[PDB]
Design a protein around this ligand. Structure first.
Ligand SMILES: O=C(Nc1ccc(Cl)cn1)[C@H](COCCO)Oc1ncnc2c1cnn2-c1ccccc1Cl
Ligand SMILES: OC[C@H]1O[C@H](O)[C@H](O)[C@@H](O)[C@@H]1O
Ligand code: NA
Length: 443
């Protein structure tokens, strides 16, 4: 049959309750490996200490600048903390050319510094010297709140001279090379962490941050005794899991499919960020493409006919997956339209089913990691039912028509003894860097 042979292929994307439970428990075990001194260095899940600590509430009053780098698109923000407490923000967006992302680190940071300069000119404040927080969305071994070494680029970044170097130093050196303004860089955080802190400001039960964007990652508050990499037992510290690398020691092998290996082999970082490659917005559009090329070379789609755009890597953009999915066949009709194609009414349906297969597997995979984080925190405390708040940001989670609903329901089935509240960050990845800076300044 025509339709059933297609479902057979699509069916491989399914994950049973038991699969997701198995993925979850293994995540918890990799988490524990990343935390312990004995196994940390070999851990796929690095559980990197952030120096962001549980602390009495409050910060300095004043103006704070934040930068947010985590993709081709980035953001400068001016945040005003006033006191009872109020936080007001102003932002601008900047798009980074390919040139600046695949040349040197100096070039990337000079662009960045040019953007800051623009931001300050347009807010009549170029003569002010302010504290600055930096949300830097790549794996970093922190040595303190304001010092961190880039372990490796992810999500397709390549700038040379950065890995192994203090990223804060590179920011400052670029600022000084320009000589057009001055800033005190006082903090550097992951986007998870910034999202968590921005969320915590609104709801003090927010102790987890998650991003499902171009990439996928989470952070959470750990007891200090469990954070063996940092001396001390008292209080809590935020740990940047870098769960994107889950599977990099083979933990997911049984779940990986042909199209996953192919996305991985042609990615900027083969063999790394495998769990992220199942989920992130960087890759979800490409997985879909590769599936359609299977259904075309099975003679099961576009009467066996595939365009030049579809023969070419990157053409099926994650934004398309989101639109396809958002019953009269009209958007689907007008994403395919441009790609040089003529859906039957059946192709519209098939394409939609593919999008949905890849997207559903992402929400389900993602849900298992977060359940792991959440269920581990519950277990570490004295909870029958743990009430917890999770701050979330990212273009997949926000904009993807039903990714979020599928994710929510899957998460909830795996965390039957927690009641979870999701706070969707308006601009948390940037705002949280200002708020951490304000707390850092208080000391
Ligand atoms: O920023 C924080 N810790 C921190 C910051 C800097 C340094 Cl060096 C060390 N630890 C803590 C981490 O909390 C995580 C949840 O347990 O976050 C905060 N600490 C204190 N007041 C905080 C926050 C976040 N918002 N607020 C806040 C509240 C009211 C006004 C302004 C702020 Cl801003
Ligand atoms: O941007 C979301 C995430 O992307 C990748 O997983 C980065 O390695 C990570 O640091 C970041 O939190
Ligand atoms: Na410790």
């Amino acid at each position: 049959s025509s339709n059933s042979q297609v479902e057979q292929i699509l069916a491989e994307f399914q994950l049973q309750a038991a699969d997701l439970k198995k993925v979850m428990r293994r995540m918890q075990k990799e988490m524990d490996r990343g935390l312990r001194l004995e196994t940390h260095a070999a851990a796929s899940v690095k559980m990197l200490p952030t120096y962001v600590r549980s602390t009495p509430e409050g910060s300095e009053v004043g103006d704070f600048l934040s930068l947010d780098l985590g993709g081709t698109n980035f953001r400068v923000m001016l945040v005003k903390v006033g006191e009872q407490w109020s936080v007001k923000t102003k932002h601008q967006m900047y798009s980074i050319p390919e040139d600046a992302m695949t040349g040197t680190a100096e070039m990337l940071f000079d662009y960045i510094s040019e953007c800051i300069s623009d931001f300050l000119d347009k807010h009549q404040m170029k003569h002010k010297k302010l504290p600055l927080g930096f949300t830097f969305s790549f794996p970093v071994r922190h040595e303190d709140i304001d010092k961190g070494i880039l372990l490796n680029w992810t999500k397709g970044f390549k700038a040379s001279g950065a890995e192994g170097n203090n990223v804060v130093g590179l920011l400052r050196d670029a600022i000084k090379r320009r000589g057009d303004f001055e800033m005190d860089v006082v903090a550097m955080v992951n986007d998870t962490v910034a999202t968590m802190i921005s969320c915590y400001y609104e709801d003090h039960q927010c102790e987890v941050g998650m991003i499902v964007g171009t990439g996928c990652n989470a952070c959470y508050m750990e007891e200090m005794q469990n954070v063996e990499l940092v001396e001390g037992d008292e209080g809590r510290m935020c740990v940047n899991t870098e769960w994107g690398a889950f599977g990099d020691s083979g933990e997911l092998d049984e779940f990986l499919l042909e199209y996953d290996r192919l996305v991985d082999e042609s990615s900027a970082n083969p063999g790394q960020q495998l769990y992220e490659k199942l989920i992130g917005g960087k890759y979800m559009g490409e997985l879909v493409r590769l599936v359609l090329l299977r259904l075309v070379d099975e003679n099961l789609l576009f009467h066996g006919e595939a365009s030049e755009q579809l023969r070419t890597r990157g053409a099926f953009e994650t934004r398309f997956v989101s639109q396809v999915e958002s019953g009269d066949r009209k958007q689907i009709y007008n994403i395919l339209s441009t790609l040089g194609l003529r859906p039957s009414t059946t192709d519209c349906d098939i394409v939609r089913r593919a999008c949905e297969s890849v997207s559903t597997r992402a929400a389900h995979m993602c849900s298992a990691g977060l359940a792991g984080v959440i269920n581990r925190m519950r277990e570490s405390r004295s909870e029958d039912v743990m009430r917890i708040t999770v701050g979330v940001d990212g273009s997949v989670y926000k904009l993807h028509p039903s990714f979020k609903e599928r994710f929510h329901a899957s998460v909830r089935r795996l965390t039957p003894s927690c009641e979870i509240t999701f706070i969707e960050s308006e601009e948390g990845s940037g705002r949280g860097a200002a708020l951490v800076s304000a707390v850092a300044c208080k000391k």
